[model samples]
Target: RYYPPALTGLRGSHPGAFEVAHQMGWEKKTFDVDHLPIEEEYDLVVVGGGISGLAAAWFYRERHPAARILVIENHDDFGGHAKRNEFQAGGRTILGYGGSESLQSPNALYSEDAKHLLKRLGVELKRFETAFDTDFYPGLGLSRAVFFDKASFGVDKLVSGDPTPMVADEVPRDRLNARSWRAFIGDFPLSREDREALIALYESPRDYLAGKSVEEKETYLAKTSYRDYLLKNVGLSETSVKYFQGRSNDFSALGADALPAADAYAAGFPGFDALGLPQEAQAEMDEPYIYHFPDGNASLARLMVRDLIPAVAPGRGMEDIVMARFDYSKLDLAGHPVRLRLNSTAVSVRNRAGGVDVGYSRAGRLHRVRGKHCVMACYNMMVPYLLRDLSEEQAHALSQNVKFPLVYTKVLLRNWQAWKTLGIHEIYAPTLPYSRIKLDFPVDLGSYRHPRDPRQPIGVHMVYVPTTPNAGMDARTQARVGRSKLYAMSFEQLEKDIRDQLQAMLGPAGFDHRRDITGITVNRWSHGYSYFMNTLYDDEAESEALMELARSKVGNVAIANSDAAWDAYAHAAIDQAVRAVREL
Candidate 1:
């Protein structure tokens, strides 16, 4: 099925996208076998043409130059969550990342194998220093603000300062304009007690937990949820607490009410001093969290694709690759050593005589392929369903990793003049469908120039996908609820919501929804970010057990993905690929 449906003039999730495998009864304990005749044979057959699967193929080729590799992808396009959205309007091209944004400081956290692969692909971290125009927002007289829509808060206003207790200190002075917590919250239509509680939440130091011992407070913080802490100790109103919880935990894929108080504090939330911990006790608080590209880490995926098939794009450097014209026809040429087959979903893999047999479906037809070695680089949770040979324990381990759902919607505007008029480049709207909205990253690389003129077309990125928290449910159950909510909304409903929210927030600043909106792309990821352990709910022993069993090599098959590493970052995908190949 064609994913995104944007190519087909649709705005939301594609019909039957990533659901065919389930609909075909692949998830059943037993199914009638229709083993198709073997059509192709290769040295390695990699499932899931995402970052990890691509990396596995590339790394395997590195070790065996003459090896023939075939990559099977579920979606029509490669890169998976590292998908790209290209918008053409006003005779100019604007690019935005669909999902998996940023490298998250690859220089510091990446494995040597990942770094080496990046180097070979001609991606240098130092190049981004000049590539990204960090001063672009400030140069345009823009600052971060909180947008309170009339539907959610009974007021349409832009509060020009950081009022959220989390990451208040991280707000640069230039972004805040010397504004105090009370000054911003005063604009919100909250009760007197809520206003006072919010002010104390952002401004207080150790007053909340003055008498508790260090150990006692540490245990309390580790065990209690952030929502509980706010309601019980900080005395925040239920409505007031809703504004702060989801704002900071969007990237973590955990809602504020689901995250532990200690984890929240470690993520730069306020009230940590109340736990009696020293200022220096926070881990990695002093490190710079800067490592990004114009299209985020999707650029890294492009680099990988380019290296695997030089015919797909021509560029030796990262900057040039950003503007490279990719030739999709060259991706699956017959004579190519590495072939990437899109829209091909692998349903089952089994160890045959001295080789592994892979069964996949494309265009309502079943096809079989043979490979001496196979790597299941797809979602870890799907492995149990796809491979029937796994033991009960192994199947349980593989099925435990339930990915969190997220939506990264990019709304293409005819111009960003309205934002310039309002003096804001980013907004935190906690109560809306999207909790966060920001202008596309500023980077002028190759033929792509970040819009400088107010009249130039630009993209506004919105992120949110209704998460369930404090429901006494496991992460998997919470993710299932979130996914259901995401799918239940139609594209028309989503577009209307976007238009309404924007009109309410920006109508005063000369934003015309009908005249300014040129295009819309809703990158709905039902299985988005990989699952990470929650300190309050997840047990360390159970997690380790799952990982060990899930990643174990079976016959000629090896497992690899970000889920294998329990990390949602790009480097983890690459690292797992390297490890999976080493298993052979």
Candidate 2:
């Protein structure tokens, strides 16, 4: 059996590309996998014990009590990419975190399925009527006061007068009322010229604001990508144009380098007008809202797993599973113990009349398992080997449908207390040397690190390295050997660069290298955000088809995951699990 490099262990270069090459009969192994397999028999077996797999196993057990079920995971433990590292401070808090921490509620026009799933699962939703505000920290721009004030669209006013804690029940109507500050400004009694200026802003934020009175610029354009839009619609001062365009290039992953000004403008600032306002005024009213989850929606992955095979989960508290860091080898494998065999690799799959025969290996031992059905929940790259029956066109369509760009980076950070002693709050300038590198603001901590306090404050940072979207090879290659790896930087070099840049932006009182950072960890995510490739194949339609097929039981396999659902969200994940089980 052969596994693609991209889908295998961490390789400095693109493991996927090398794996593909090897799959054609090359002898080199770019990935490391424990190839010994444990032979087991069960009525139903699930492969890839991620959220989707867990959901399927749990649902199947609930529906068919008499049937035996098994779940197999390649990683040492479950939860997939959804994980957190805890640094032993006075209490438990994420030292370095990844995966989801919050979920943006379904846009007003799109949240029925999400709502239904939460309701069905009896997940309690606490209402939070009051709105929180976030300061704009543009790494490559001007002063925070200039770029992050109330007049700026990037910042929002903290809501205070609400009495009821807003809950999901209040979201349908209340959320609609929380319009962008730019939108609110549109309702300001504007003269005909103001309205015209506002309309023109939709076409080009920089052009419209450049010629307008200072009030108009503050009231309308600063929050938008003025430089890109202005270059297309109308000309502006070269210097001013650079300022505007440079900011857009700095903040977005698909920066100006990858796409044209128009494309960038289109991709970043959608609904500048058509949603309700005129096109010309659309850019002026755009705002990016940050969302939070009270239930820690990130915990959904753990929840699914524990629910699936309760016997395997110690304490059966998947919802409470939060770890800052741990030794992967010490996983508890008692009692059905969610059989997650790390360093293991799958070799091949053969379809049978009733189910599928899956061959894999771990620790140099080859093993086979006969499952009633098989689900390939991995990335599209695995289709060639896992789903051998897929036609060329179908494979191409599935692979191409995902828009993944190789935006990679390693975050280097020092503590927040050092920042405070240095009198630094946040960096909002776009011209700072390291401005292109994305910065992470302290989320669970404030700007205080007490040496005696035990708890150290670390800032999570992000930098985008360009790559081919959606391929694990492209993802791994960039992370391991590409320009984005910050861990490769020497301690002095990394700290010096950030501190110097901060000093330039915040005077000498910006950052203190020695007193701040204690330790660091490197993180690599090949496919981070899913930019839904606009296409004719509606996700809802595809989900319906998969559901229909699963229920017919022509084969023992079942499809469960965000891929099987039109929308990829926690609520959707839960709903799809229930629906799949209901069909079963």
Candidate 3:
């Protein structure tokens, strides 16, 4: 059987899966047909086999085992944003998360519906506390560093120590330089004033809006960009503000100038460290970021798919799901209650009197099927085109969810000895093609073993947010521009950028991309993160009203996806599925 996970290079939004959807959506191409042979009638038919699609089928199945469900996915694999990449290096299997790295605040972020699904999947959250090897990097004297490239900086240099940690949860406490801010900033290559300003910003971080009331302070933060906050409010030089341009790219998908100061502080941006203001309830703050499987959230998706269609895999629980080799042939085995049709794009859905008729394009032909109920579990933007009978208001609102684009590039290395030699596990190159590169997460489970030594082969991770650097554009504008750029580039172009960036950063420390690298998988999601409303850019009340209309059911057809919720987390996808299933 063919395995999609093991396939390397240009994997996410892979070729053959998205062209039809793109053409129909982008060019307003419509499929005109009066009648097509209805293959068979299913109790329910779901479009898009991502997390939301699978969960919708599962929830519906639980209500009636007698129900026949069909899930058609445009992609060869399910999981959607929850992607797992597998590689063979040095005679062992290595794993990396191409997207959706881990569950974020399962306790607080997840609804009871979401929590119930995880519990039903046999996911034991506490196990990750031990499964994640937090000591591995620090044990090797590895720490984070910032790389200054020649294009942005005058010379190429790797400066050790970051006084302000980017993601506090993943960082090793002991490995971080605990020296004074003066000592750390002293080493950086910056103008004297820039260096002096950074030291004061860290040491004497007073509130710029000192006399304002709490409400006024928050209102000010919402309007001002974090980059502007640093320069205008904190009295920092342009050079100092430039240092933090890409700091929040991975977290918020926005550059410093585009992102608001209010959210910037909320997401760990340094400018607002000492801003005297209230904070949200910190209930989820105590939760660690280690709640992950060896293969990221793909294991959760695998378990869900297995339970929905037992013939797909044999493993009974989450423990063995990571190692379970699913038979692709069995995914749609005849006579099964749940059938998963891969590489088929849903073209249209028409609501009949008693049932819905869904048309899908497969093998250059449009096929129709009848279903008692239908769930539009695909991307939100496509819903406007697929279900074209919706009201003009609803159609416009559904089209509002233009996803942000980001790339998760996974690389297989012969060995991570160069990382050990340089005493660095994570490198932050703000202006490089990929802003951050780090050793993959270490999580040992069931039969999977994370590399115990730097000498052993390992999979490394690099992330790039392709955003247009227009000084003050909102995320949706940048996302639209970035999506075009992301689609235009070929695999060779991405691979070249990867090779050049890595060689520049790691070459002097006895690292050669030609010899050390074995595999490259560019998981490019042009329609990546579901667009969420930024308080700074969007009118909250109007946006909220549109989202409500966007997600509402169209007769027997209900909508579901992370896009519907306007939050791009796994829990949002799962929760939206439960809501969609409940709607029916």
Candidate 4:
């Protein structure tokens, strides 16, 4: 496995894609057209090589088999957010998904066209169920735990078992004999007031809203924040409340204040008036979150690319393709009906007399290309900067889709003996730089084997840089601040943090950083998850109107991405691509 030196730098999304544009003062509303030699012309030009852009090309090619299509991507590799990372140790190769974790029930959420695409790719969800060894952790007596770090808390101890309020009251004595919930919370170096407040906040019923009308209580929960709900109704200390702040909104990227109390309750957080809720709110939870591949949705991207360009890789089904090595040189073969050109950043797209003119920068030189039709499947916010001819209303609408920043780091170890000794598979460190750390999902597919022996090399995945909005700061502003903080950090600092965090938590169990650590990859996505409307502050009508205008066809150019649908799901990207192509 080879790690790119470029990735060792800032890494992930926005990794120098907008540098030329920024230098030309595009962000400041300045656009200078540099006349460059026309390189090539195609029947269709896709602005991004992401799933959306690739889907657009694939759909367009279906209608025109002989059509010449070109997909220009800013990154050196394709797949966009569905990036894959490879690691090798102890004569074994392991793969980890960098982003876009999974396909959330394509059969249910995806359109017929999207479903057809998945079917053509041979993605049977049942196969993943068989491929994934879900019982591995439970069999090993490994469970979730909360890590109180020395840097944040006084002691760096991993308290086993779910110590939260809702589950603390129900754990069996036999189970607690090894590790009790009471003892886990009791070990926290907090005062009696703080500990009791936390316990009350988790275990207490929604009696605080008793005697109030259903409408009044519902409105309060809808408008109030979890922090406020705990402090005001549950009588929790501010310090204790901070621990539960980003719990529900960590993945949503909205933080807690922008995330409503009702939403928090729906997301499994306690302290809601559950009795007054509608039938739907009290219904059973949605289908369990399942993945189709070990490398998450990146396999979906691989399947899509292979379908469009069969020469890119060998093998037909998903299992064989997981370990298949791609032939990048064949991606842009001459005379090919569809060509993918990576490391090319589109800087400008303008409507010409009979077609669209696309300008891009590659190897520090500007080049021009033409297409009869164009799909801007890149980031929604960057659309305005690339296509200056769009109406001010459309530009303004496109600019409002601010994305959330996220960082996914994967650290490969010589062995997972330390984890087995600690009897924990996942640890939530609220105060650490990386808020969450978990053992990699167990999957044995093709030649790659999941770690069964404690001595086998395994990967530890860590999620970092969650944007928690402070008082008076909106989600977008908070994301901006988090992005700034992430960029300010050096790789040296990140490595040190990872090493120290692991040493503090696992060192007692015979963990040695210098001897055990094999590889480290910090996948930092500045613009990670696509922007979704928050119930706390976002107006549905406003968000829908902006999305409509942003995605509306402008001349021969159409926008397509997760941002076009205001969703972060893989199916949304495919759906938007189909719509964008239909617009043309």
Give the poorly placed runs of model 3, Cα more than 4 Å off.
172-179
Model 4 residue runs over 4 Å out of place are 1-10, 14-18, 24-34, 105-107, 163-184, 273-275, 279-284, 466-471
**After aligning candidate 2 to the native by TM-score, how far in Å is the CA of 324 from where it should be?**
12
Using TM-score, rank the candidates from best to worst: 3, 1, 4, 2
* Candidate 2 overall lDDT versus native: 0.38
Compute each candidate's TM-score over C-alphas: 0.93, 0.59, 0.97, 0.92
Taking all chains together, the TM-score of candidate 2 against the true structure is 0.59
Give the per-residue lDDT of model 1 (tens digit) for 1-584: 23332352232235544655676434453332345678889999998888999999999999999999999987867887887777887887788887878776555577799889988887787776676776777666677788776665666778765534333122334444326778877766777777787777767754566688877777788788888888887777788887775765466776777778887777777667656575433333432344565566777777888888889888787778777777777888886888998877788888889788888877866788889999999999878767757999998888888889888888888889888888888888866777778787777776778877778889888887677766887667888898888768888887897888788778888888998888888888888878888767788788888888898999999999999988888889999999989887
Q: Which candidate is the best by TM-score?
A: 3
**Tens digit per residue, CA lDDT, model 4, 102-218:** 666444566788878877788776666667776667667877777776644566777776534321111222332244435556666567777766565545555777788878877
> Which parts of model 1 are misplaced by more than 4 Å?
1-13, 24-34, 163-178, 278-290
Worst 10 residues of 3 by lDDT: 165-174
Model 1 poorest ten-residue lDDT run = 3-12
lDDT tens digits, residue span 1-584, model 2: 22111121121122222233234223533331224343664556655555556666665665676666555555434543443322333343333334333444434322565554344343333322222123322221211111112222233222211111112211222323233434532442334455345444444344333455545433343233334344444443333233232233222333322333333334444213322222212322232223332213434554454444444334333223332122233332544423444444455555666666666545555677666656544333333344444556554444442423222222334444433432223332322223233234222212222122212444443333343222323222422343334335444554465455434333334444444444333223434332332211224456455434422322454444444443444444545555555544
**Candidate 2 vs candidate 3: which has greater lDDT?**
3
lDDT of 3 by residue, 1-584 (tens): 58998989998889998888977987878774437778878999999888899899988988876999999899888888777799998778888876878888777678888878888888887778788887777676677888888877677888766656544365555556435679877877788878988888877788788888889989989888888888889998876776788877787776787888888777666656566777624656545677778778888788899888888888776678878888888898766879999989898998888788899988778888889999998999999888856999999999888889999899988888888887788888877778889888788887898887777788888988886664567778898988888878999999999999989999999999999998999999888889999877888899999999999899889999989999988888888999999999
Query: Which lDDT value does model 4 have at 342?
Result: 82
Off by over 4 Å in 2: 1-38, 65-67, 75-77, 89-96, 106-123, 127-228, 234-253, 256-297, 311-338, 361-365, 401-507, 534-555, 558-584
Q: Measured by TM-score, how close is model 1 to the native structure? A: 0.93
